[PDB]
Every structure is written in C-alpha cells, then in structure tokens.
Design a protein around this ligand. Structure first.
Ligand SMILES: CN(C)CC(=O)Nc1ccc2[nH]c(=O)c3ccccc3c2c1
Lengths: 823, 207
C-alpha cells in the first residue's frame, strides 16, 4: 500500500508495533521467492534519487483479538516490519553479521526434503549469538508430494524431525537469559508451505477455522492439531492414543484436518478428475474467478493453493505475533551492543529504547546513491531521536571517549527512509527504527556510531578495512570496447567505497580490493554491468610495500639532463609508530606544520627542527613517507619545491625494488645546486633528478619489502576447532587467541594470516572444519620480511623476481649506480 | 612503406609495439635497396616519434633569423637517447620516457654532408660551416657534423630541406620507463642493430 510521510512517521512512533528482522535462508531454498511474496503483499510504497535496495518496509494489520495473543507490550492494530536484506553466500561473513546486528527477529527458512542445511545452520548460530529470536518455515513442501509422493504420516514425521533438528540448534546456542526460544508448531512459530506455488500455513490458521465446528477455544484446537492427538471418526471423540479400544489405528489430528484437505486437492487436480475438483473446491470455499476456472494441472493447483493458503499471510502472522519489537529486544541486547559501562547513561537509554536520551544511532553500512558518487548511511536508532540538521558526533572505529581521534562533529544534512530503492525525507526518527542518513559519506567509511553524549562509547564495531591488498590488471579482449572499460572502472569505484581503480605508470588499469573474494565479486560486476564488455583479467596478486632498514650507505646524488642542477639526499627509516600515526590521521598532511611538529617532536621523538621542515608526504600526498628539507642556504630552493614534491609522489608510488609502494621511507634533502636562470630549472629537469636521487638513496639505505597480513577471527564448535589450527599451520598462520562462549560449545579462534597465503582460504577451511567454521578476516598490519629482496634465491627476492618478470621488467634489480650520477 | 612488415607500429611508454630486431633488419635492408643510407639517431617524445614515422619530419614555423635551424640527430644513440623523453611534466607531474628514431636520407644527398672539428656554437663555426657548404647559413640541402660542445659527442644538423627528405623508422634500442634520466646502457643496444649502424664518411673540405 501507499503511505504518506506522515503515516510512515506516525507508524514509526509506535515502536511497540515495529518488527526489525531478516530472512536466514540458503538461496536455493526459495529465499528470494518467499521474501518477494511478502513484498508483493505488504510492501510499503510512498504516496529522483535511487539507492541500492537495503531494506523493505512492510505493513500489516491484525484484529484486537490477535493483538492480545502477543506476549509483549503493544499498542494499536498496525505494525511496521523492516525486512533488512541479507547476502546470498555465507563467505560474506562480515556483512552477514552487519544485517543481523540491526535486527531483532529472524525468519529461518528450512527445506522439507533436505531439512536444515549446514549453511543455514551456521547463520542461525550467529543470529543466536546476537540474541535474535527465530521463527521457522519449512519451504518446498510441494517437492515432497509431487516427487516423493510421500504419505500423510511420513510427511508429518518429516516436519517433526526437521523441527527437531532446528531446536537442537536453538537450544544449544541460544542464551539461557532469553528463556526457551525453541520453535513449536503448536504455538504458531513454525509455518509450512511452498514458495513456488505460493502457499503456506500455520497450525494457528487451521485452528481459527476448525475453531468452532468442534466447540473449542482455538487455544486447545491448535494444541491438538500437532503431536499426539486423535479424533475417532466413529466414536467422534478426542483421544490421546493412536488406537481405538479394539486396536485399530487412528489418524493424527494434523494428518486429519490439515494434511488431508491439502493432499486431496493435489490428488484431485493433478489427476484431472474434473468431477471431484469442483466439489472438493466448494467444500473449502475456494472460489475460482472466471478465467482461472479453465486452468488444469500445475497451472490450476498453483492458483487454488494461493486462494486457499496465501503464503504471505502465514509468514506475516508469525512475524507480528512472535518476533520481538525494537523494545523487547533492546532490553536484553543493549549490553551486548554497547562497548561501554552496562550502567552508562547511554547503555541504559539503549535498554529503555528511550527517544529522549542522548543519540545512539548505529551505522551498519554505507549505501550507494544516484545523487553523485555519494553514499547514504544505513543503520538503526538505538537511543534518542535523529533529525535533519541536527549536528551529531560521528564516532569512527578508532574513537575512544578519552581522546579526540577519529571524531567528526558535523551536522546531519538529511534524514531519509530507506524505502527499498527510493528514499523519502523525514524530519526526525525516534529510537527503535531503521533509518537512513544523508551527509556522512566523507566521515564514515562504512561502519560507525553517531551520538550526542560527549561521554558515549562506540557500539559493537564491525571491523572493516579499506586497504587494497589484492589487485589485478584488466584489459579489453576486443580493443574496440576500450572506452567502455574506462567508464565502468570509474563506475565500479563509484559503487563501492573499498574498491579501487587506477592506472600504473605502465598504463595498465588496476582493480584492487579488500581480499580474494571481494575483488572476485568486483570483477564479475565489471565484466557484466559497469562495462559489460568482455575483458582479460590477470591472475590475483598481493600488494607489497618497499621500505628501508637503515640510513643510506653514503650520500645519494643525481643531476638533471641539463647537467646544471644537482640534488643531494639520504634516505632513512621511519618508525612503525610514526607510519601508523600517519596512517591513522594523527600526523596529518593538512595540519599546521607547527602543531604537527609539536606532536612529532613530543610524542614521537622527532627533532622539532626536522618536523617543521616537512615538504610533503606520499604517495597521493598523504602516504607514510616524508621528504625533509635539511638544505642550508640554497638560493631559489623554493622555486623547485613543487617539482621535488611531484617527483616524490611518483618515487613513492612505484619504488625501485619492483614497482611497489614505498612505506615508512624518510628522505632528507641534504643539498641542492640550481642554475641561476629558471628556464633551466623547470619540471622536466628537476622532476627526473629528484626521482632518481630518491631511488639511489633508497637502494643505498638497505632495501627490504613488507608483506600485508590479515587478522582472522573464526567461530567454530569445539569439535571442529581442530580443522582450524590444521589449516593455519599450512599457511604460516599465527594464533593470537582462542576463547569459548561461556555456555555453548562455541570456540572463537583469532589468528594472523599472511595475505599472500590466503588465496582460496575459505575453500580449504570449508573441507577442514566440516563447514561448521564461520570466518571473519580483516587487514591487520605490514610485516617486513627478513630476507634480501636483492638476492634472487632468498624468499623476498623470489617474490621480487617473479613480480619483476610478471611486469616484464629487467629480471635483476637496478643497483644504486644506475640512478646515481654516471660519474 | 619502409617499416618492413608485421602489423601496425606505434609508440608506447611501455615500449615500441610490433618492432623486433628482426623486423628492423628487414626494414634497413630494404631502405638500402632503394638507395637510402642511415645517418644517425634521433631521440624525442612518443607523440613526436609518431609524427615523424607516419607523416615524416617537417619543419614548422622556424625562426628565419635563427641560422642554425635544422633537425639535430646523432651517430651515437647514447647522445640521442638523452632527448628521448618529455621535456616537461604532464598536468599530474609525470615525465614519461620517449623513443629513439633511426634517420635515413636518400643516398643521393651524401654530397652535402660535411664535418668539422669546431663546436657549432663557436664564433669560427658559423664562418667555417659556411665555408664548407658553399653558402651562408642556415643549412639547406646540406648537413654539418661536429662536437656537441668541447670534448662532447658529435651531433649532426641536417638543414630543413634535407630533413624533410628523410625516412625515419623505429630503433630496436628501448628507452627505460623506470629510469627516465639515466644514460643509455651500452648492453641494451642489440648487437644486430649495431651491425647496421655505421655512418657515412663525411667530407672535411668544401665541394
Ligand atoms: C626545442 N625543441 C623543439 C627541441 C630541440 O631544440 N632539440 C632537440 C630535440 C630532439 C633531439 N634528439 C636527438 O637525438 C638529438 C641528438 C643530437 C643533438 C640534438 C638532438 C635533439 C635536439
């Protein structure tokens, strides 16, 4: 239905009547199909900016009678359901947790024949870890009848085992505090049906029907519809034994009043017995509407079943009557989501979902919009109320109430509703809802916390990283479409914050991502959408870094082509601390040279003199490398600065060991000799000189290369934890810590995994831990290899040689003499 | 077409596309067969390189009052090498490498190539060059070869008329994309190119 901003807003005020959930299900189990059905049924539409569908709004109403069956404070008969989107494959670990972390309920879809598959089993565990209440649905029942032609009782036993498997998981991993959260068909928290045909039901639905034909308060009618309850046709009595006085068998209630009606329509219709179909239909009060009347076979059944048991409503019934509101859940989920004092003024505000308290808005992800290459923040308001124009404190990943690091006190440009693909402006939004924000893109990379309390900690952060550690070269197989590639690359980088596209000096087009899969996906979407033009992709490669271990053996020197200008310099190492400081905004390029100097001098042991002479950082004008002007009385020096800097940008972007980026490299310009006339001191002249000197210096300062390393966090049952250490030991992995979740048998191992050793990691971990393991890995740090990159047989040199060959460069590494003056 | 055969030739920072030593050899042999001779190397930028090989060398708005106007080249690729690179930065700040060109003139012009020991800029140069060529500068259908500067390597200045009659093709000597500013490395010159790189013997006395 269509709603106005007011209606929506009004609906968002009754949080007790809101439901934040997700759909946990394997894609091959009608995940997409079932979800649609809810959209095609209760999808909310508003009465020119498009976005990437992240959440769908659903509306549903119920009778004052139904509202009562809700064992949780409510108000009104209207309900707002937020269907938050989930990934297709489990490998997307990090974003699976993202969706879950903002939901309270969950619609777990299980298959009739196959039951609970491994994958779904795993995600369900994670959901339980976030304290999500599950509600089950056994889909694909049709496949049971049509294919297996199973009997009423065998199909029953099936569901039984299935529901049993699920609860084995639910009880083993749900928190004791939460209380019994197992699903029980008799209690209306398990629906059965078929997404294909579009039907589904709950014991509670047939119980409201058979409700009076027997003189029963449905409470006991649905209680009988499952388990061991029988109705003797003859005695016309309800018994609790599968046999009558003599010993003859008795059909269970479920098989009698539920499975039988359905089983006949199937048998009637699929056998084309036109004499029965009409009779059978009228009895169930199923009125075909003109055109549908002529249908027969699947076509018909498909239409009958829809009018009979509308799949959409069965699911929408469970969502409202059993899934917790953003009020019930936050009371027991707050502590877990706040990384501050469980009694902190905010943590409390979280529990009480108080719209009056200081803001506590959680940003789960940044979504691409049409309005430029801008991104809108997607999240949930756990406390207080967010409103357009309101200025907020944007607390990033590294923030800590104590310091001022990673903070951005800005103003929220606009608040909008994530109506799937379209956004709808709204003044404010009280705690308990999923909302969208406009104007944070340049403050939050992906995840983050927005507050108002100056003493507010961040909420359970989700480690993400923007460090390009894997990349490839893209080429067009048919040269004609080249411009179409030049466009999609620009298009791709615009859709994702963490992908990167650029051109190397060699003129190649590069695509770099967060990991093997992340890039993998990026590449598909490029050859299929953004460019849709056939491409030649190069094999995966790990990005390294070129660095120095000491000060240049001796002064490095180079002169321009003119032979009139000279640059004298030396290179020296930068402390990992400083580099990190630079990487983490502490030491900033845009800062006041004086303030910045004070910092480096004080907190990092740098001579305030040198620090005040910083000429630039690099690459990209902000990398962890510096050029320090230690010259003394060099006339015209400033007239060559831009050139010097420019050169430094290229020198640091592609070093001399093998084209990789420099890291933690210090360049001190010792002396300079310049032609008196500017004409001869142009860029064409200085730029190459500095570049060469730098290289020389570099090669003289004892060269070394760094390799990136991941920090992988793994969830896994004590039983399978074996496979973990197993694979970690064949990848040079380093265990950092292993803990257990108090109650359950769920260990959580954390270790370091060398990026250049992580190719196909998930695939191998799969086999190893019987698929019970759930990975979560992010870039952690750069490791300086010990071996000499210059020695071909060494370990680093091996990397270098291969890389060099790959790039078609001279197999050997240039000695410093090649860049030093040819004197 | 003097480029031998084997697919479109282009100039990249990456290297000259489609130009093996073998092809060079064929091109050179066939230029001789039509009566052309190699007179020197000419380094310059990729864009430029392209214009000279497909469109030929052409003067364009020279300073008529500039008496040494012409097309400079060199017998020694190393000296040519130096000019194989952008002379200024691109907007971003990149100075990319260029390419070495091999210059050939119709054998029929050799009668106008002269040599001297004076350094072309020197006061005497002017007069002595003119003495050798039979007319006042600039050079026209003639060429002068002499020290780039005292003790330096030798450069050659074909007059604009002669230069417009040249035929230039790519060299098998690559420029280094990762060392723009370095001096040509003697070992990167192919031996086979060395074989076909002798220079004609220029006259030291007027005609
Ligand atoms: C001002 N520019 C259009 C270019 C210029 O004045 N000269 C230029 C441009 C390219 C040149 N290339 C050479 O190989 C060469 C060899 C010996 C002596 C000079 C050159 C040479 C000279």
């Amino acid at each position: 239905v269509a709603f106005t901003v007011d209606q929506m807003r009004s609906l968002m005020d009754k949080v007790t009547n809101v439901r934040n959930m997700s759909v946990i299900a394997h894609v091959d189990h009608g995940k997409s199909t079932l979800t649609d059905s809810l959209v095609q049924r209760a999808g909310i539409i508003s009465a020119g900016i498009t976005i990437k569908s992240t959440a769908i709004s659903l509306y549903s109403e119920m009778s004052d009678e139904d509202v009562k069956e809700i064992k949780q404070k409510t108000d009104g008969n209207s309900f707002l359901i937020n269907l938050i989107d989930s990934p297709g494959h489990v490998d997307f670990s990090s974003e699976v947790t993202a969706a879950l972390r903002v939901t309270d309920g969950a619609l777990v879809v299980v298959d009739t024949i196959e039951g609970v598959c491994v994958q779904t089993e795993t995600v369900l565990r994670q959901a339980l870890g976030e304290r999500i209440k599950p509600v089950v649905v056994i889909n694909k029942v049709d496949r049971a009848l049509l294919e297996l032609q199973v009997s009423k009782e065998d199909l029953y036993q099936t569901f039984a085992r299935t529901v049993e498997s699920v609860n084995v998981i639910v009880s083993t991993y749900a928190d004791e505090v939460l209380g019994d959260v197992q699903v029980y068909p008799a209690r209306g928290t398990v629906a059965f049906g078929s997404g294909l045909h579009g039907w589904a039901f709950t014991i509670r639905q047939f119980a409201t029907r058979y409700a009076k034909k027997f003189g029963v308060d449905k409470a006991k009618m649905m209680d009988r519809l499952w388990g061991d309850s029988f109705f003797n046709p003859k005695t016309k009595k309800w018994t609790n034994k599968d046999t009558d006085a003599e010993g003859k068998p008795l059909e269970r209630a479920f098989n009698m009043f539920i499975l039988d009606p359905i089983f006949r329509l199937f048998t009637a219709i699929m056998n084309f017995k036109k004499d029965e179909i009409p009779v059978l239909l009228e009895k169930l009060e199923i009125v075909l509407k003109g055109d549908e009347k002529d249908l027969e076979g699947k076509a018909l059944l498909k239409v009958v079943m829809r009018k009979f048991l509308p799949a959409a409503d069965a699911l929408l019934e469970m969502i409202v009557l059993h899934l917790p509101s953003p009020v019930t859940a936050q009371a027991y989920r707050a502590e877990q989501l706040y990384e501050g004092p469980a009694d902190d003024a905010n943590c409390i505000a979280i529990k009480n979902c108080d719209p009056k308290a200081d803001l506590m808005l959680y940003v789960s992800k940044m979504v691409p919009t049409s309005d430029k290459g801008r991104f809108y923040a997607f999240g949930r308001v756990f406390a207080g109320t967010v409103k357009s124009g309101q200025k907020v404190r944007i607390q990033g990943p590294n923030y800590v109430p104590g310091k001022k690091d990673d903070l951005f006190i800005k103003a929220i440009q606009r608040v909008v509703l994530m109506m799937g693909r379209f956004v709808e402006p709204i003044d404010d939004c009280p705690a308990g809802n999923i909302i969208g924000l406009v104007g944070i893109d340049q403050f939050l990379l992906k995840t983050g916390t927005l507050t108002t309390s100056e003493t507010a900690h961040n909420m359970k952060v989700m480690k993400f990283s923007v460090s390009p550690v894997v990349q490839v070269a893209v080429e067009v197989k048919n040269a004609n479409d080249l411009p179409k590639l030049v466009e999609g690359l620009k298009r791709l980088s615009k859709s994702d914050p963490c992908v990167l596209t650029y051109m190397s000096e060699s003129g190649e087009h590069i695509v770099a991502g967060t990991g093997e899969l992340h890039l993998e996906i990026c590449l598909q979407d490029l050859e299929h959408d953004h460019a849709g033009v056939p491409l030649k992709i190069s094999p995966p490669v790990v990005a390294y870094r070129e660095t120095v271990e000491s000060e240049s053996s001796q002064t490095a020197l180079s002169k321009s082509p003119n032979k009139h200008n000279r640059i004298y310099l030396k290179a020296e190492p930068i402390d990992e601390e400083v580099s990190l400081a630079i990487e983490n905004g502490i030491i900033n390029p845009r800062d006041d040279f004086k303030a910045r100097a004070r910092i480096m001098a004080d907190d990092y042991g740098w001579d305030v003199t040198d620090a005040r002479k910083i000429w630039c950082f690099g690459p990209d004008g902000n990398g962890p490398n510096l050029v320090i002007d230690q010259t003394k009385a060099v006339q015209y020096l400033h007239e060559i600065k831009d050139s010097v800097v420019a050169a430094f940008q290229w020198a640091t972007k592609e070093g001399p060991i093998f084209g990789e980026e420099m890291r933690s490299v210090r360049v001190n310009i010792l002396d300079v000799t310049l032609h008196a006339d500017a004409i001869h001191r142009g860029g064409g002249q200085i730029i190459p000189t500095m570049r060469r000197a730098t290289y020389a210096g570099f090669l003289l300062a004892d060269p070394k290369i760094q390799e990136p390393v991941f920090l992988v966090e793994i969830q896994c049952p004590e039983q399978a934890v074996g496979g973990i250490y197993s694979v970690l030991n064949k990848k040079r992995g380093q265990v950092v810590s292993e803990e257990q979740r108090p109650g359950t048998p769920l260990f959580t191992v954390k270790a370091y995994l060398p990026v250049n050793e992580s190719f196909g990691f998930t695939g191998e971990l799969r086999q190893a831990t019987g698929g019970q393991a759930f990975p979560q890995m992010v870039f952690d740090h750069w490791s300086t290899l010990g071996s000499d990159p210059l020695d071909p047989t060494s370990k680093a040199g091996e990397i270098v040689l291969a890389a060099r060959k790959r790039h078609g460069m001279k197999e050997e590494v240039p000695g410093w003499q090649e860049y030093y003056d040819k004197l | 077409e003097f480029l031998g055969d084997g697919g479109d030739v282009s100039f990249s920072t990456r290297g000259t596309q489609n130009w093996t030593v073998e092809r060079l050899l064929q091109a050179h042999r066939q230029l001789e067969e039509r009566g052309y001779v190699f007179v020197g190397y000419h380094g310059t930028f990729l864009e430029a390189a392209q214009s000279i090989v497909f469109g030929g060398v052409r003067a364009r708005s020279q300073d008529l009052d500039a008496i040494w106007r012409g097309f400079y080249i060199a017998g020694d690729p190393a000296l040519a090498y130096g000019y194989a690179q952008d002379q200024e930065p691109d907007a971003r700040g990149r100075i990319r490498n260029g390419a070495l060109l091999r210059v050939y003139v119709p054998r029929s012009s050799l009668p106008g190539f002269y040599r001297t020991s004076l350094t072309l800029a020197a006061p005497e140069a002017a007069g002595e060059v003119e003495r050798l060529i039979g007319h006042p500068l600039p050079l026209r259908l003639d060429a002068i070869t002499g020290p780039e500067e005292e003790g330096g390597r030798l450069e050659t200045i074909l007059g604009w008329p002669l230069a417009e009659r040249t035929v230039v093709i790519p060299s098998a000597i690559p420029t280094d994309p990762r060392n723009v500013g370095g001096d040509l490395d003697p070992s990167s010159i192919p031996d086979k190119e060395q074989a076909i790189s002798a220079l004609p013997d220029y006259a030291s006395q007027p005609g």
